[PDB]
Design a protein around this ligand. Structure first.
Ligand SMILES: Nc1nc2c(ncn2[C@@H]2O[C@H](COP(=O)(O)OP(=O)(O)OP(=O)(O)O)[C@@H](O)[C@H]2O)c(=O)[nH]1
Ligand SMILES: Nc1nc2c(ncn2[C@@H]2O[C@H](COP(=O)(O)OP(=O)(O)OP(=O)(O)O)[C@@H](O)[C@H]2O)c(=O)[nH]1
Ligand SMILES: Nc1nc2c(ncn2[C@@H]2O[C@H](COP(=O)(O)OP(=O)(O)O)[C@@H](O)[C@H]2O)c(=O)[nH]1
Ligand SMILES: Nc1nc2c(ncn2[C@@H]2O[C@H](COP(=O)(O)OP(=O)(O)O)[C@@H](O)[C@H]2O)c(=O)[nH]1
Ligand SMILES: [Mg+2]
Ligand SMILES: [Mg+2]
Lengths: 429, 4, 420, 429, 420
């Protein structure tokens, strides 16, 4: 009766969505044939046997969508919910937001409407898009504006892949990241900053694999997403719906950029060796080594922490461990938020994807945090912006696509104001 | 055909 | 779907293009009969395949070549627009006087071939710069088509002559004349020379008598590896426009250098590894590129690296970051993260990895300089001018053409001086 | 004790009639030989053994009537209902309205009279005329007038293949189309504008056939005809007699030009991944994209909407779905019609044509909409007329066949006076 | 039931007629004896079939011509009327004195041939416009038969004189004198000129030695395709009259242009898969039509296209729409949707797809302009005028003919330049 929509726009969004749908079909026990031998949240039964997933796949480049149309999951999805364009985004935000973005987003809205009408208790939206990309920013922002002006009260929670402050996969990330940030600032209620670098040092320090590949990253993000949605999916002692999140972790309607963390993250070599106690698992959840966003949480001060436990969980030792964590001097919250921890519990352990470098374990903690240190990211990112707009580098590629030249300034200006608030909160009274 |  | 056309003019252009079609046919698994054993080919009855290409020249002698060398029965018999007089090493004969007579037929063939597309991603042309047929007709065609298809973009693999190798005694004239408008309405001028290829096949491959065959084979393989990442599934895909943003900061600073990796001989092939560290150490030096311009005497405004095969994105990414923050001086500082990478999932035919290193640098400006040098010593005395003005072409143009060059090189030097 | 009489004049009429008799014969279990290995509404027994259809097939080019005289149904139709002349219509109205038909109408009317003499519960007539042509236009209008002055009270529907908006199949079309529309204004109670442009679009997108042909077009037209006539033919919990349409959808005496639609016209695959209940089926039935005619109902008001459901249909969902579809604000009705809905129910699921592209499904809807946006079509068509009458183009081929020239003027202006109705009724009280 | 008599005239008309009859016999599966292995042929005792055609000429050479070639025994001696002298390239000698005494007899052989049919759809003529015999006799006969049967239409498959490559020295006089009368009592003057035929047979089939047999065969194929959609069933049928209604807006803009498709040689035959858009690109090309007049230099008043074979009608109509919409300049505005289509169901002998294009277009007034130029140049000096004025002709009829020609071309120009 209650369910979520799943949108996957861009390149990285669609790959991580492929991994996420693999994990979802695996957990409930759904085969890639669509026939199966709780799914109301994600799937929908087709009258007799088969299941169609609630999902749309937007990308103007056919290559990845062609792959998924001829991959191992060619039979599951609906042949219309795989919407493909004909030209690349070319990492210039205006390309997927003004010129061709006007062409396919109306088709996306048609399909989304026809997919939501066949639902009853829809709750939110889970969009997936790298911001550094061209269509992952342009088309994503256009779609978000359309959905905001269309539905309204329905929550919206993106999971964006922000560029690392050190590793670079493009040279124009600052531009089409600032633009999509200024667009998404007021549309998506809860934007979880998922970085792409810290996951590498994570899977090098815990999984001990030296040469990791994007597929591992996508599997781990899929694990986080499943650990999140398990509350509406399954039963448990403390069910927490999706409309819970944007209610606990949004102090001010503008500051909502949260960073996540997941545990336990360990391969098989030490799995039997280490004990993985509830106290130690929630201690590893808080160590600054394994936060997906590249930040040292000690720099700032937390504002909200939602911890979701799944599997075998004993609430007494949970409370004891949380108390110890509250007494740790290395972490501390702002003064004006004494009740800092929100907790949910479920009745299901994780599931393992054959090939997933992770190991099977009875307990799992996914902890999301609205904090302050994350601010610095924007700052350093904003840094790059200056050293590009001080010489109008690459600007003509944008001005040639209809986007006004000076608009950048506004966006830049606005982010400065954002940073303003990330200092107006960290101050005591 | 009968071209040639 | 994102299809590409092929124009090849001039002797060198036609030779390299024939070799490139050979390499592609051997990559997609197409034997010389056009069977398997839309980005480049078109379907035809009985499962035959026609390469989407137009071959133009003012002397039909090159016909011999494109009919003698392997993969000659592939091209279309209507796609051979040939002249009869031959431009004969003079630019005027192929841009104002005679080439101006068949350029319209070439335009008609271009229109009949582009309308058959459904999503035309861009253009790519191959030609010399002194060759009258090549330079003249190719530049005129570029002018016309860009005045026709403003949305699409052209990526020309023009082959400039470097003076370290002496070929003809009138190159600087045609070179500067073509540069005067090649910086005007062209977006990716990947320059190639001959001195770089000779130094490569001597001191990098230990070959005995470096011949045009293997030189053309190498440059064609590089030309393929450039855009391959669209012909196949990839983890971080690209096209001919994801380069047109990552590698053009300004609408004229678009002159690209090309490098291929890996390159070794038999024994060296046996006794060495093929990994990210070795390929990276192999590609960022000076003499693994195809330009006789020492890059360590300049900087790189931006540098793209299209890997091919299969690897761990973290490995190539960390290697790029490390090679950048160690070569901080030789890179430009007023721009952040000036490097880019892009990974496909299918290696070429023969090896397990590949690396195409494309660079919008500020070193090749010096190249123009040296060419301009000869220009002055062939213009101050007005030497060898009685072959140009005698064909309608007004001399005055030449003068301002040189002026234009200055602006170009000026820009580069100016951007070599910028800070923050 | 209830039946119809179908006429198929012109060239398109005989084609769609061929397809429609194919569908009828293959639904009622009537072999193409006329022998059985409900039909009182369409067929009739010749005392014993074989069935014969109730129809008349006129044309002037002996081509198509001969092709059906020696095709697969050479031994089904009585050889006296296939009336072919000698010369051709040649796309000029006066050729099939003053010279050729001048005496062929006598034989046609005598045959129609001999047919009606045998009918026992005759309800109405179902003509078929591609007005873009010559004979279906001229002879069609002449036969319409002759029947209206001969019988009278009997209802008279029609299924005209108007000229498409954009694609061209003739150049003298706006002449012999305007003349037919002016001669069809009063004698016909129901005009159902069909256009080969929208159905080409549909066959391209929904039926996934990229290279369609009038065969598939006519299959779909036959499906619409049968889904409309199932009310009379077979049983239904809420039936309508075609004299229903004559009074539900003709508010003012002159305006009766309506557009049809059908659902779900979906391929095998695109329906295999689909729940496809009454809700989705009716929310897609209203979709302006897949209307048989060509217009933009989102840019106009609705005036009346009949919807005949067929198959195993639950009435509660029908009621709720019509409620929610009247809830929408983009679909609005005019002030003078608050109860803008009509429904019918037939228990007969749709029959599939053996070898047809259309997929088999249990629930189907057929919609007949009297709207006011279709008005603009006439204008657009009238537009073309002016660009030809500004210089008296092609008029000599008409004045040569006895047609008084001034007629054109009258029609061209009088049809324009038709606008006086439309642009008035779209205005609220 | 829509039959067609086939009147001929002159040596060229007679050769074209023989070629057309043998090609039609090939299509309808007849052998050169007239046995199977009503619109054109007639039944005859013993299951034989005889063409419904008459053959007239002043010289008995063409008699032995149509006897020598194959399928010469299909015809009947009752339709072999033949004089003795031959007008010897003199117009008046086939229109006033010598030709007259034949036309009377010809009337007889028509009147006991037309009434042989029951529902006659109209005539069709095959002759030349320069030769005295063909032009003069055909003009007089058009006059007589339009006086007789005004209700039926009379196509004139005419071959206008070769404009630049002249073979005789008295073309302009004959052409002008004949057109002056043809413009009155004709309905479909589809012009053909050997310049365009040699152009096609050279630059589209690369043939070795083009003789008149090949040109006659090509015009035969076009002639057949013009009415084959009538001869056979189809998804959307046409006739000889629907064409007329959809092709002329005024009673004297009825002069057409003809085009056939497809046409390639073995080299190009190997390539270029057969598909409707390729056929459109072939038919709407300039040089692919039977008239030496680049159609871009005028506007298409209207144009019909008959297809033969099986295809998808949506593709046909969509290609027609795309081509009339993209090149809106070359088409005319004040008339909308000015293109027309039709589709048959039986293609030619082993030709999966066949297109015949007939277009009324104001790009053909240039031909008459230049012919009248030659005329008025040869008339200001009264050159070669005694040969005509000695045979009862005056010198006023020539001025009347030239003024009528100029009135026709002025009509074309005036109602081309009109707007809305
Ligand atoms: N977490 C994760 N990120 C990815 C993955 N693949 C690509 N990315 C990121 O995608 C970003 C590159 O921009 P793209 O998303 O490819 O550009 P686009 O907007 O989708 O459109 P195109 O330019 O046509 O690719 C980089 O920052 C990648 O880190 C993946 O599999 N997992
Ligand atoms: N739905 C459908 N429409 C057709 C079909 N065939 C032709 N049409 C349309 O009918 C029109 C053709 O005009 P015709 O009906 O052939 O002209 P006519 O009145 O019959 O005059 P004659 O050909 O002399 O008999 C065009 O608009 C066609 O799109 C068909 O098979 N199915
Ligand atoms: N890599 C390579 N370069 C060539 C080859 N042939 C010619 N070139 C260069 O092409 C230059 C001039 O261009 P070209 O096409 O030969 O002149 P044109 O054909 O007479 O107009 C010559 O000066 C050569 O240096 C070849 O086979 N391989
Ligand atoms: N395609 C074709 N053209 C011809 C033929 N014969 C003549 N022509 C041309 O038609 C013109 C003269 O026509 P001709 O038949 O010789 O005059 P006639 O003796 O009065 O019939 C000249 O331009 C000839 O070149 C022929 O057999 N086939
Ligand atoms: Mg992308
Ligand atoms: Mg018709």
């Amino acid at each position: 009766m209650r369910e979520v929509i799943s949108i996957h726009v861009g390149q990285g969004g669609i790959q991580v969505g492929n991994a996420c749908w693999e994990l979802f079909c695996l957990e409930h026990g759904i085969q890639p044939d669509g026939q199966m031998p709780a799914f109301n949240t994600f799937f929908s039964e087709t009258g007799a046997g088969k299941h169609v997933p609630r999902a749309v796949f937007l990308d103007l480049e056919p290559t990845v969508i062609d792959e998924v149309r001829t991959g191992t999951y060619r039979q599951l999805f609906h042949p219309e919910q795989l919407i493909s364009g004909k030209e690349d985004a070319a990492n210039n935000f205006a390309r997927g937001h003004y010129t061709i973005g006007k062409e396919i987003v109306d088709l996306c809205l048609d399909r989304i409407r026809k997919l939501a009408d066949n639902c009853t208790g829809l709750q939110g939206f889970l969009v997936f898009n790298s911001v550094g990309g061209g269509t992952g920013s342009g088309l994503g922002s256009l779609l978000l504006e359309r959905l905001s002006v269309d539905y309204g009260k329905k929550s919206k929670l993106g999971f964006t892949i922000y560029p690392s402050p050190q590793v670079s996969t493009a040279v124009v990330e600052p531009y089409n990241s600032i633009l999509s940030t200024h667009s998404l600032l007021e549309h998506t209620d809860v934007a979880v900053m998922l970085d792409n670098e810290a996951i590498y040092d994570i899977c090098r320090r815990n999984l001990d694999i030296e040469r990791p590949t994007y597929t591992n990253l996508n599997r781990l993000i899929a694990q986080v997403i499943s650990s999140l949605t398990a509350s509406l999916r399954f039963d448990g002692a403390l069910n927490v719906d999706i409309t819970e999140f944007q209610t606990n972790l949004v102090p001010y309607p503008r500051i909502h950029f949260m960073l996540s963390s997941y545990a336990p993250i360990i391969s098989a070599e030490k799995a039997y060796h280490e004990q993985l106690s509830v106290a130690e698992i929630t201690n590893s959840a808080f160590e600054p080594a394994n936060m997906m966003a590249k930040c040292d949480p000690r720099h700032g001060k937390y504002m909200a922490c939602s911890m979701m436990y799944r599997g075998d969980v004993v609430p007494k030792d949970v409370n004891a461990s949380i108390a110890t964590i509250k007494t740790k001097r290395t972490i501390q919250f702002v003064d004006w938020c004494p009740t800092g921890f929100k907790v949910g519990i479920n009745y299901q352990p994780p599931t393992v994807v054959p090939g997933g470098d992770l190991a099977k374990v009875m307990r799992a903690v996914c902890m999301i945090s609205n904090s302050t240190a994350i601010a610095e990211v924007f700052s350093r990112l904003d840094h790059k912006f200056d050293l590009m707009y001080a010489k109008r580098a690459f600007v003509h590629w944008y001005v040639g696509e209809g986007m006004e030249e000076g608009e950048f300034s506004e966006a830049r200006e606005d982010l400065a104001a954002l940073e303003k608030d990330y200092e107006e909160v960290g101050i005591e009274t | 055909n009968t071209n040639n | 779907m994102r299809e590409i056309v092929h124009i090849q003019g001039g002797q060198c252009g036609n030779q390299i293009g024939a070799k490139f079609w050979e390499v592609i046919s051997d990559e997609h698994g197409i034997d010389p009969t056009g069977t398997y054993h839309n980005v480049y080919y078109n379907e035809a009855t009985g499962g035959r395949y026609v390469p989407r290409a137009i071959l133009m020249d003012l002397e039909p002698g090159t016909m011999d070549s494109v009919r003698a060398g392997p993969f000659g029965q592939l091209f279309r018999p209507d796609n051979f627009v040939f002249g009869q007089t031959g431009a004969g090493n003079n630019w005027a004969k192929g841009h104002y006087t005679e080439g101006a007579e068949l350029i319209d037929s070439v335009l008609d063939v271009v229109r009949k071939e582009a309308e058959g597309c459904d999503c035309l991603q861009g253009f790519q042309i191959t030609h010399s710069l002194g060759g009258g047929t090549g330079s003249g007709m190719g530049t005129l065609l570029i002018s016309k088509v860009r005045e026709e298809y403003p949305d699409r973009i052209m990526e020309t693999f023009s082959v400039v002559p470097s003076p370290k190798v002496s070929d003809t005694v009138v190159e600087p004239y045609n070179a500067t004349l073509s540069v005067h408008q090649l910086v005007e309405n062209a977006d990716e001028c990947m320059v190639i020379d001959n001195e770089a290829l000779y130094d490569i096949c001597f001191r990098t491959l230990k070959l005995t008598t470096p011949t045009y065959g293997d030189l053309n084979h190498l440059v064609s393989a590089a030309m393929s590896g450039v855009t391959c990442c669209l012909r196949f599934p990839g983890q971080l895909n690209s096209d001919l426009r994801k380069l047109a943003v990552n590698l053009i900061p300004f609408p004229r600073l678009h002159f690209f250098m090309i490098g291929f990796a890996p390159l070794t001989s038999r024994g060296s092939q046996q006794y060495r590894a093929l990994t990210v560290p070795e390929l990276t150490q192999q590609m960022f030096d000076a003499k693994n590129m195809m330009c006789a311009a020492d890059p360590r005497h300049g900087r790189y405004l931006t540098a793209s690296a299209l890997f091919r095969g299969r690897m761990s994105t973290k490995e190539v990414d960390e290697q790029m970051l490390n090679v950048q923050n160690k070569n901080s001086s030789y890179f430009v500082e007023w721009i952040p993260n000036n490097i880019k990478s892009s990974i496909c999932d299918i290696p070429p035919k023969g090896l397990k990895m590949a690396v195409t290193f494309v660079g919008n640098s500020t070193a090749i400006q010096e190249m123009f300089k040296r060419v301009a040098e000869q220009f002055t010593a062939m213009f101050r005395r007005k030497a060898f001018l009685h072959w140009y003005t005698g064909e309608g072409m007004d001399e005055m143009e030449f003068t301002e053409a040189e002026s234009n060059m200055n602006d170009l090189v000026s820009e580069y030097q100016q951007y070599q001086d910028a800070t923050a």
